[PDB]
Amino acid sequence: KYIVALDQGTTSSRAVVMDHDANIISVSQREFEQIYPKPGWVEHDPMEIWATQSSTLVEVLAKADISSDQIAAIGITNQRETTIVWEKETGKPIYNAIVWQCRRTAEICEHLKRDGLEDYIRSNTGLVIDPYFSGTKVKWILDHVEGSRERARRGELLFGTVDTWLIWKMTQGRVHVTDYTNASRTMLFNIHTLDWDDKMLEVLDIPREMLPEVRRSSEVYGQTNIIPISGIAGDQQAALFGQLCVKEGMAKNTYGTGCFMLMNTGEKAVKSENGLLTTIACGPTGEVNYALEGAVFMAGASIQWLRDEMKLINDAYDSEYFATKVQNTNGVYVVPAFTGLGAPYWDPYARGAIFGLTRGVNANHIIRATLESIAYQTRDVLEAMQADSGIRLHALRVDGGAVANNFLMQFQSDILGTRVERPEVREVTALGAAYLAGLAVGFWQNLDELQEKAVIEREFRPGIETTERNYRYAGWKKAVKRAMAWEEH
């Protein structure tokens, strides 16, 4: 007997099989194509998410020699914000999925601002006016398709998120539900009331007809044919959970496609005053908890950029190696605002920029710089976190893909002047979803059954270079300020 998790990431879709002992049994990963229709735009093919996920699943079961018979439940984690619309009858997108990064609905926000919903929006969504979240994405979609809104009021049109969509594709159309975590990300949902905001739904001309049903992050939502799908949570929040976020003051940082720092606020929705989002997470049984989140659009992807377009490296892994060949960036800085600046800057107009080049800067300075950007940004978000919450971290718990980079890790540590703790299992995001599902199935009963699979693999302590950290950051700050507001409107 085991649980199964689905992690449908920005970069790729995954599938994990764990035993009762919470052991990672087998995994299935399968990258999928990112598409760039225009400049600040990012999209994905709904059917490809779909496809890649389904497949990943099988392939795993198969890999381990497991039968539907032996799987207790199914957990689901996905990328946030990223929006989808689909014909009810057909099971067909009326357009590609707009990505969380996707800067297209920028102007719309410009209205929203112009109107004065800033205060409102913050206050009830806990969010911030930004093309990052779901509202505008939906609106833009209907505003760009002829038979749309109408087709939707009559209710031929479904709205959703990777979870909403991943679910309905498996429960043959039976189930149209999202979880609490997910929904908070959308801009259309009220965090205090724990429900759809009407004033939002109005303002942005969205018709309730499309919104799915919203539910606990643990609950059997339904059954499928690999059976019961018992857990759903936004990736970031799942990782929070799997790190055993779960208690007030607890925090993690995730280094994946982007970067997300979350801190559990129990039952108190703390108002951010430093460019952080206020949002939903789980309490120890999947219950609504609140949280502070710092979102950074680009981290592991920069690496992928050096990897796939710029072509400097053959593997992300190789970045540790080249970056180390150099000691210093040689004065170079890399503001990876390839899709704007998120927290705490929130400038959907900043665009990438490299700075401080001279004749003898080379490849390696640049790679290293790209790595370093990752730490700077974390630091940026960190400070906000501390201010907002009034609590000072003594260590940083982390997880994610990039966390394998001793260089980055260490460098993180120094530039932070804080211990960095690296969990023994990188796949934490997944674990969350499992837990969320097995708890919900009595597969586990209690989180405490588990206070042990969170063995720490390694501690990163500040080195004497930690002394330079303020010097280095300053430039970073200086760089940033010049990447901002590139694009016009």
Binding site: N328, G417, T418, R461, P462, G463, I464, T466, T467, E468, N470, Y471
Partner: protein, 161 residues
């Protein structure tokens, strides 16, 4: 007009004053990594003038490019870290002069770096010069002396193991 050429008077782990002035509580340093003893532990020194020197016989390890700080391992298995002033990396190496080299074996006392106490006095964020033992755990006991110290003469710390 300088005594470098002349003979000087010459008299568990003892760490010798590597620079001169009055000893100060690490806790006194206006930088957390110092004060909260994150980088390690030891004392700090408000300097008197002209030069920093090895505080133990051993081998110099790092010598910061802006040479305002350096590290060194003792023949007894202790890592020391000396960091002239605060945020001094911003001075961009101005006020400093590297005498030694990145890998040297040194006796207590050999010149490691030289400096300009007054430019540093008005240019630097602070002048305190922490001296810390980095390999905190590998050491048993850490005893902190007081008052005035004289370079390559008075000891600032006694350490067990």
């Amino acid at each position: 007009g300088l005594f470098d050429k002349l003979k000087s008077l010459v008299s568990t782990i003892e760490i010798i004053a590597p620079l001169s002035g009055e000893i100060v509580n690490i806790e006194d340093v206006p930088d957390v990594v110092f004060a909260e003893k994150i980088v390690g532990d030891g004392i700090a020194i408000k300097p008197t003038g002209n030069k920093m020197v090895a505080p133990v016989d051993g081998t110099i390890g790092k010598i910061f490019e802006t040479n305002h700080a350096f590290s060194i391992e003792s023949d007894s298995g202790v890592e020391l870290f000396v960091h002239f002033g605060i945020d001094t990396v911003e001075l961009k190496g101005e006020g400093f002069k590297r005498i030694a080299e990145e890998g040297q074996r040194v006796k207590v006392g050999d010149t490691v770096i030289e400096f300009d106490l007054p430019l540093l006095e008005e240019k630097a964020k602070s002048t305190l010069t922490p001296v810390v033992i980095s390999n905190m755990d590998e050491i048993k006991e850490l005893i902190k002396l007081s008052g005035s110290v004289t370079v390559g003469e008075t000891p600032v710390i006694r350490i067990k193991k």
